[PDB]
Ligand code: HEC
Ligand code: HEC
Ligand code: HEC
């Protein structure tokens with residue numbers, strides 16, 4: 001593949017909306033975020049019926065949370081994960097690329 005999204009996409013969850021810009025993640029491979037599905041190309045919602053549908057549960061491969069605030073070991077690369085490694089160089093953006101309160105994610 002589809003065309004790289006231009007207008008920020010909303011990541012509706014429980015009762016909050018966290019906008020996500022693709023530009024910033026234009027260099028980062030799509031395979032990095034958009035992991036293959038059963039060894040097949042996909043581009044459905046991160047929380048599509050069957051997948052990370054659960055937005056409440058914390059742990060679980062079906063939790064939209066476990067695929068965001070999961071710095072531990074996983075099958076793919078998490079956001080907070082990369083970010084952590086990213087800020088690794090710029091610990092001054094940790095309040096943006098990891099910050100819980102007043103972050104590029106949580107406003
Ligand atoms: C993580 C840093 C990402 C990278 C790298 C790319 N995309 Fe992405 N994409 C990401 C998120 C968090 C979302 C929203 C999921 C949600 O449901 O909240 C998306 C969404 C898309 C879509 C929209 C899917 C739809 O419902 O129609 C498309 C078409 C898409 N992404 C394409 C795309 C391409 C082509 C990328 C590489 C060039 C790419 N994305 C990178 C996160 C990330
Ligand atoms: C993007 C860079 C994020 C950063 C940084 C942090 N979080 Fe987050 N969080 C993010 C999204 C996209 C969502 C919504 C998806 C969903 O699962 O609904 C969330 C949601 C939460 C929640 C709500 C889950 C619930 O309680 O049911 C909480 C409590 C939460 N996030 C906490 C949290 C903390 C403590 C963070 C710092 C370590 C943090 N978030 C960073 C994306 C991002
Ligand atoms: C169903 C078609 C899915 C969609 C859409 C997305 N993911 Fe996913 N993801 C899926 C499964 C079945 C699993 C578990 C792997 C297994 O052991 O079978 C995962 C895993 C992840 C992980 C790692 C967590 C783990 O269990 O190791 C992450 C970080 C992750 N997924 C992120 C992610 C993102 C960002 C998505 C949208 C861009 C996304 N997934 C869509 C199934 C599906």
Ligand code: HEC
Nearest residue numbers: 019020021024025028032077078079082083086097104105
């Ligand atoms: C590395 C593999 C990354 C992964 C995985 C995710 N993001 Fe990321 N993010 C990354 C970089 C390099 C940056 C910019 C920091 C810099 O080097 O200057 C970011 C920034 C963001 C932001 C900030 C918004 C903005 O500045 O416009 C947001 C909101 C963000 N990232 C969200 C996000 C989410 C939700 C991810 C998983 C769904 C995610 N990122 C993955 C690198 C990487």
